[PDB]
Symmetry: none
Subunit: 120 residues, 4 copies
C-alpha cells in the first residue's frame, strides 16, 4: 500500500477493569489497570481502533482470537463508519512464562471491507 | 449436535466455478448445516464439493467424516487450504437460522481446500454468530 | 489482509533521554512511561515502535511527524530480522494538547530497507 | 549555500524517459548539487529537466530560481508532485560528497513534478544525510 502511518492516543488513564479485562488479565475488580486507546491511520484514513490494557501493578507466549462486533457510536465516529456496521475485532493476550497475563489488546477495524487471509 | 438445512446436487454459481476450478455444467453437491453449542446455534455453513469427487459416497460419510472418507478412499491426499475471514451483518435468513437479530455481527469464514495435487475439493462458507464465537489463531 | 499482532518488549518508568526531554519538554528528573513493541503482520516483523508519555500525565490534536533514516542497531536488527547497519526508515511523532503541551513521543523504525512511502501534492 | 557539482545536457536514461515521459533523443538538463547548513552538507540532489522547457533560461535561473522562473516565464502552472521516500546506505561517492562514511544512513527522496496540464517537468532524486536531516510531513 506504501502509505504513511500515524496515530492519535484518544485516552490514557488508570482504572478498575471491565469484566473482560478481569477475565483476560486474571484480575479482581479492585486491581487497577493502565489503559491506552489509540486510533491508527494509514495516510489519514482511519484503519483501526486499538485498546491496550496492562495491570498497573506491572509499573513468554501470547495468543489471538478473531471475532465480529457491531460498530458502537463512539467507534463508528473514530473510524468514520456508521453505528451498527459489522467490524472485525482481534483480541490478543500476552503472558510471561509463569502464564501471568500482562497485556490485553483489542483491535477493531474500520469496516466492513477489511478481510484477513490465511493459509494452512 | 448439528442440523442439516439442505443437501442437493446443482450446477455451480460462478463463485463456485471459480474456487472449485469447474466449468458451468459440472455439478456440485451443496450442503447446508447449522451447528449448536449448549443447544444454541453457533454457525451456519454452506459447503460445495464437486460432485464427480463424491457421487459414489454415502450421505453420512460426506456429512460426518468427509476428510477421513477422502483420505480413506479418494486416492488423493489433502493439501493446502486458504481461509478468508471477514465481518458482515446478519441477513434475516441467517438471523433466522442462527436465532439472532437481523443486522447482528457475523464472523464470516470462506475457505477453499485443495488436494496435494492442486485439485480444489471444497468451498465452504461459514457464518458464525459474533457474540457467541471466537476464532482461535494457530 | 495479513493478521497483525504485536509483542511488547519492554514497558517501564524511567528518566528521559535527551530526545525525550527535548520532544516532551521535560527535565532530567521528570519520569516517563516508555513502551516498546514489535509489530508483525503474519509473523513478519514490520516495525519497532517506542512510545513515551510523561509519567505525571497519569483534549488533543494536533500532532506532527518527521521521517528520516537510521542504521539498524544490533538490538533492533535482531527484533526486526535484518542486519546491524542496514538503512531503515524512522518516523517520529509528537502529539500535543491544545495548549501546546507535548504528551506523547513515538518513534517507529521499519524492517528494511525495502520499505517505501509514497506522498502526493 | 549550495554547490553545483555538475551540469550538462544528455539524452535521457530509461528511468528518465519513463518519469519525464520523453522519448530517447529528447534532451534533458541534468544537474547535481550539494546543499549545506552551517557549512555542513545536508544533501545531494540529482535533477533532470526536459531540455526543451529550459533552453532559453540561463544557468542561474535554473539553479537558484527554478520554480519562480518557470512560472514567471513558461506560461504554465506548477501542478501536482509525487514523492517516494526510502532509506539507503551511503555509497563511497555520496559519502565523499556529504562528508560521511560509506554505509551511513541516507533518506532518499525521489520526486516527479508536473504542470497543471499533466506534463512532467522535473525528476529529482535527493539523498539526505540521515543524522543531519528530518523530512517534515505536510500538515
Ligand atoms: Mg459464494
Ligand atoms: Mg529517539
Ligand atoms: Mg534514476
Amino acid at each position: 500500500q506504501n502509505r504513511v502511518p500515524s496515530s492519535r492516543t484518544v485516552s490514557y488513564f488508570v482504572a478498575k477493569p471491565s469484566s473482560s479485562e478481569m477475565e483476560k488479565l486474571q484480575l479482581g475488580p479492585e486491581d487497577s489497570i493502565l489503559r491506552m486507546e489509540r486510533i491508527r491511520f494509514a495516510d489519514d484514513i482511519p484503519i483501526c481502533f486499538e485498546v491496550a490494557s496492562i495491570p498497573y501493578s506491572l509499573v513468554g507466549h501470547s495468543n489471538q482470537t478473531i471475532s465480529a462486533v457491531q460498530a458502537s457510536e463512539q467507534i463508528a465516529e473514530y473510524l468514520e463508519i456508521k453505528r451498527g456496521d459489522a467490524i472485525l475485532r482481534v483480541r490478543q493476550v500476552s503472558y510471561f512464562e509463569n502464564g501471568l497475563p500482562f497485556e490485553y489488546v483489542r483491535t477493531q477495524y474500520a469496516g466492513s471491507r477489511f478481510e484477513f487471509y490465511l493459509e494452512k
